[PDB]
Amino acid sequence: LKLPTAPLQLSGTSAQIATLLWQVAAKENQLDKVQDELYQFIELFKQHSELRRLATDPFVPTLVRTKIISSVLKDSGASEITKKLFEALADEGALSALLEVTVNYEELMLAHKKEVYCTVITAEPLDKLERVELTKKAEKFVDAGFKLVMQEKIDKKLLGGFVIEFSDRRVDMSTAKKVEEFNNFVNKLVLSI
Amino acid sequence: KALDELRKPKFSSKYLIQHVSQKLIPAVK
Amino acid sequence: ADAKALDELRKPKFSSKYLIQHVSQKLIPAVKEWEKSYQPPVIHLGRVLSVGDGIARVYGLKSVQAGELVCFDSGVKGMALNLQADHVGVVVFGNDSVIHQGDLVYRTGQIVNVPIGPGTLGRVTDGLGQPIDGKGPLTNVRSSLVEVKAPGIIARQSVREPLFTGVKAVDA
Amino acid sequence: EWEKSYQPPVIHLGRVLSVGDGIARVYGLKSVQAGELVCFDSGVKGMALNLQADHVGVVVFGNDSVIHQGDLVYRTGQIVNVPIGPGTLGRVTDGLGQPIDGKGPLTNVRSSLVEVKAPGIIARQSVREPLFTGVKAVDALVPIGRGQRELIIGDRQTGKTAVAIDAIIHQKNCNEQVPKAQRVYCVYVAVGQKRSTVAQLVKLFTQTGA
Amino acid sequence: PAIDAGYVSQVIGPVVDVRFDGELPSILSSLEVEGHSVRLVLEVAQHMGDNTVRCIAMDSTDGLVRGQKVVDTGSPIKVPVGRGTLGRIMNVIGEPVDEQGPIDAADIWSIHREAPEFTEQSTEQ
Amino acid sequence: GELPSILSSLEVEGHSVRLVLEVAQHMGDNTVRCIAMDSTDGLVRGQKVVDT
Amino acid sequence: FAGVGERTREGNDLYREMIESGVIKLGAERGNSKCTLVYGQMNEPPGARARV
Numbered sequence: 001l002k003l004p005t006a007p008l009q010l011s012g013t014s015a016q017i018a019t020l021l022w023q024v025a026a027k028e029n030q031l032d033k034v035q036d037e038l039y040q041f042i043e044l045f046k047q048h049s050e051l052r053r054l055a056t057d058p059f060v061p062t063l064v065r066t067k068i069i070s071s072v073l074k075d076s077g078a079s080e081i082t083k084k085l086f087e088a089l090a091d092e093g094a095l096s097a098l099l100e101v102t103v104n105y106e107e108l109m110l111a112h113k114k115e116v117y118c119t120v121i122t123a124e125p126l127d128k129l130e131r132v133e134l135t136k137k138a139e140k141f142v143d144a145g146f147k148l149v150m151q152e153k154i155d156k157k158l159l160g161g162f163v164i165e166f167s168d169r170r171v172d173m174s175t176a177k178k179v180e181e182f183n184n185f186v187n188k189l190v191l192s193i
Numbered sequence: 194k195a196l197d198e199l200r201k202p203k204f205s206s207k208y209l210i211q212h213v214s215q216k217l218i219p220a221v222k
Numbered sequence: 223a224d225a226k227a228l229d230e231l232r233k234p235k236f237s238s239k240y241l242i243q244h245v246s247q248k249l250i251p252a253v254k255e256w257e258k259s260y261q262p263p264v265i266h267l268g269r270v271l272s273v274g275d276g277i278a279r280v281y282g283l284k285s286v287q288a289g290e291l292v293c294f295d296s297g298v299k300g301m302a303l304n305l306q307a308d309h310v311g312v313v314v315f316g317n318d319s320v321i322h323q324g325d326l327v328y329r330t331g332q333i334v335n336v337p338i339g340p341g342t343l344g345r346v347t348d349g350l351g352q353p354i355d356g357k358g359p360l361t362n363v364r365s366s367l368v369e370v371k372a373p374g375i376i377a378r379q380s381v382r383e384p385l386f387t388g389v390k391a392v393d394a
Numbered sequence: 395e396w397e398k399s400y401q402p403p404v405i406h407l408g409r410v411l412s413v414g415d416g417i418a419r420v421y422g423l424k425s426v427q428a429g430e431l432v433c434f435d436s437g438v439k440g441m442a443l444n445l446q447a448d449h450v451g452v453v454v455f456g457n458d459s460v461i462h463q464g465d466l467v468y469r470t471g472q473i474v475n476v477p478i479g480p481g482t483l484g485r486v487t488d489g490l491g492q493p494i495d496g497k498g499p500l501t502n503v504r505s506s507l508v509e510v511k512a513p514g515i516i517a518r519q520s521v522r523e524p525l526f527t528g529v530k531a532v533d534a535l536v537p538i539g540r541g542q543r544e545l546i547i548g549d550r551q552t553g554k555t556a557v558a559i560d561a562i563i564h565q566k567n568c569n570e571q572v573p574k575a576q577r578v579y580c581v582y583v584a585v586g587q588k589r590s591t592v593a594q595l596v597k598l599f600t601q602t603g604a
Numbered sequence: 605p606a607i608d609a610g611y612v613s614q615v616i617g618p619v620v621d622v623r624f625d626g627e628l629p630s631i632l633s634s635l636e637v638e639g640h641s642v643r644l645v646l647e648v649a650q651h652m653g654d655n656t657v658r659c660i661a662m663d664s665t666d667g668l669v670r671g672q673k674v675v676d677t678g679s680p681i682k683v684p685v686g687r688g689t690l691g692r693i694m695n696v697i698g699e700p701v702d703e704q705g706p707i708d709a710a711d712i713w714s715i716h717r718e719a720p721e722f723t724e725q726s727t728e729q
Numbered sequence: 730g731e732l733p734s735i736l737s738s739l740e741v742e743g744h745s746v747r748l749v750l751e752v753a754q755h756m757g758d759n760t761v762r763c764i765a766m767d768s769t770d771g772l773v774r775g776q777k778v779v780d781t
Numbered sequence: 782f783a784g785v786g787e788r789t790r791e792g793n794d795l796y797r798e799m800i801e802s803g804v805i806k807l808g809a810e811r812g813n814s815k816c817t818l819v820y821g822q823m824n825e826p827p828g829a830r831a832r833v
């Protein structure tokens with residue numbers, strides 16, 4: 001039995017559940033269906049105190065905890081992946097993992113929609129041709145046919161150019177750093193000559 | 194915040210994924 | 223799972239509420255039919271998570287001080303050594319064979335203290351001040367802490383008075 | 395030539411998860427190598443030592459009080475390296491290259507890695523030339539050849555450093571008398587000592603000339 | 605006023621965990637616990653990782669409740685230095701423990717500093 | 730249900746010989762930790778245990 | 782004199798013998814003192830004796 005392959009690999013025991021919950025939701029094309037099923041349970045814990053008591057209190061019996069979730073996830077809002085996840089997480093008392101199994105589910109989802117969220121921060125505000133130019137420059141830094149979602153910010157400590165913040169990497173094409181590396185190379189080279 | 198009590202999870206089982214896996218994958222059609 | 227990414231989950235982002243309202247009309251009747259199996263929830267009291275080796279782990283006790291006499295419902299005293307984020311580790315002044323998991327722990331509001339005064343003079347007590355000589359409770363007495371800090375440099379003077387022992391080897 | 399071939403390279407970032415006791419656990423830094431120098435945004439350097447699935451364990455080259463939770467860690471791309479060459483002769487450096495004697499930068503020097511594989515079997519020959527220490531209890535009874543490693547083991551305040559300082563000072567006395575090819579250039583690594591203990595040795599190596 | 609005034613997360617003997625919901629204190633910084641019976645200074649030792657710092661108590665932690673307000677002072681433990689400290693008794697946090705009044709401070713220096721450099725050393729016997 | 734006390738005796742129901750366990754600690758999550766007075770070879774997870 | 786983890790009685794002894802020999806001067810003569818005492822004696826908690 002081999003599943004769809006996950007977009008990105010993640011760490012264990014809370015992101016290992018999300019890696020499998022994503023795989024049995026991409027088998028029925030329910031990736032966007034079980035995602036807001038997850039988001040509604042994030043909200044249900046903000047509302048209800050007897051629902052979050054089934055994830056923090058260690059003195060609720062495991063017979064009770066697996067029969068409240070099974071006796072409210074019926075006849076509406078099931079999706080049969082959400083309905084079987086939260087009755088599996090209530091068996092082992094792992095309902096407190098619902099917050100971080102959601103977070104790592106999005107990190108598989110956002111790498112499945114192929115968007116890399118970006119931040120381009122330049123010296124002066126951009127006009128129309130600079131935007132099309134550095135967008136073409138910045139799409140040579142995404143490691144797929146990824147759809148860059150450039151963010152624009154202003155920092156005049158840069159004297160022209162741009163610096164791209166991918167939140168995982170940073171490529172600093174600015175001219176202030178070009179001046180700094182120029183001067184470091186010059187002071188490096190005149191002491192070897 | 195009223196969701197801080199679920200910030201980090203605690204598990205009674207190192208093989209939690211081995212129980213979730215036998216209940217998630219038979220639930221597909 | 224970054225805390226930057228777990229902080230954005232406080233904001234609502236469901237964009238559909240077709241089973242928020244489904245269970246929020248059904249959650250309370252399902253909780254109500256299991257009330258025989260609910261122990262009453264504990265916030266300012268405590269409930270024993272696990273007891274063993276003369277150290278109990280106590281859930282709750284939200285307002286206990288560190289180093290405080292707690293009282294298990296079987297009348298055995300304890301001392302809250304380490305307050306943790308999830309439990310309180312208490313140290314049992316007694317045998318732990320009478321503490322069970324699920325027992326109630328009561329905060330007493332006072333750091334570990336013994337009866338001091340003129341009325342404890344003459345009595346045989348245990349390590350926590352309760353008398354064991356059988357002649358009744360400690361009367362003419364008041365409560366004071368057992369972990370007082372010693373006096374400082376300026377509160378002392380050099381020893382001058384000669385404290386006779388009655389032993390010739392010692393006093394000579 | 396530098397400006398016509400200049401791509402400003404992509405710098406992979408990382409967030410400090412925790413920090414304390416000279417260890418910073420770093421989130422991210424997914425393309426970092428084992429043993430690679432990393433740079434914190436406080437300016438203090440680091441070395442990625444155990445790469446784990448969830449974090450990087452980074453030993454901090456300096457005081458870890460300037461690193462906070464959520465600080466940015468940049469990887470330098472390079473394994474740990476020191477400046478080598480004849481421009482290090484005469485100078486007092488710290489644990490990685492940087493001179494601490496107050497005489498400016500190391501002129502006439504070149505960087506190379508600190509963890510180099512030792513020469514194998516075919517790269518050697520037998521130890522035949524003598525290394526004169528100038529200590530006659532050593533040069534008679536336990537003599538030392540060039541290419542030989544010799545342990546100076548002893549108890550707390552024996553003459554251990556004094557045997558090794560005499561082997562260094564003696565090479566100054568022999569270097570004036572031998573031709574240029576067979577001169578021995580000494581390196582004294584002072585690990586965990588006092589800073590004034592090693593200031594007494596720079597003063598001794600100066601007024602001898604070693 | 606709530607941010608950079610965190611709260612006691614867990615108390616284990618001489619060691620206090622304080623959670624700061626924004627802009628953690630640096631390592632070696634001094635923190636003051638509000639509402640203790642005595643003045644309790646906590647020196648930050650580690651950043652534990654989840655907006656929590658790990659602290660060392662300079663006095664007893666008997667009486668710390670797990671929500672207590674802890675105020676960052678933004679600097680390490682600074683003690684009075686100068687010629688006005690001569691003849692006085694100070695404790696660890698620089699307070700007079702000789703009942704002669706407050707200490708005449710020419711300056712107040714943090715107790716954490718680096719060693720002198722290799723150029724600063726003295727070789728005189 | 731409710732846990733037996735520490736030092737309490739438990740009888741493993743269904744075994745070759747009489748297997749008495751003595752409760753050593755309460756581990757939490759409704760588990761007690763016991764030390765056997767006979768051999769535990771031949772013991773199945775899920776075997777009924779009667780608290781005396 | 783940095784007293785770290787020693788007897789409080791000895792700190793009182795040294796303080797009183799320094800007031801006697803005039804190394805420590807009290808009151809308005811305090812500026813003519815020659816010694817300053819820092820004390821973290823053995824009744825202090827471990828965090829106090831680690832920083833004194």
Ligand SMILES: Nc1ncnc2c1ncn2[C@@H]1O[C@H](COP(=O)(O)OP(=O)(O)OP(=O)(O)O)[C@@H](O)[C@H]1O
Binds near residue numbers: 548549550552555
């Ligand atoms: N050959 C010698 N003749 C006379 N005195 C010596 C000799 N060698 C060493 N000493 C004396 O012994 C003392 C210890 O020497 P040395 O500094 O070598 O100790 P060590 O073994 O390096 O121990 P440590 O590393 O703890 O200093 C020195 O002060 C030195 O004066």
Ligand SMILES: [Mg+2]
Binds near residue numbers: 554555
């Ligand atoms: Mg030595």
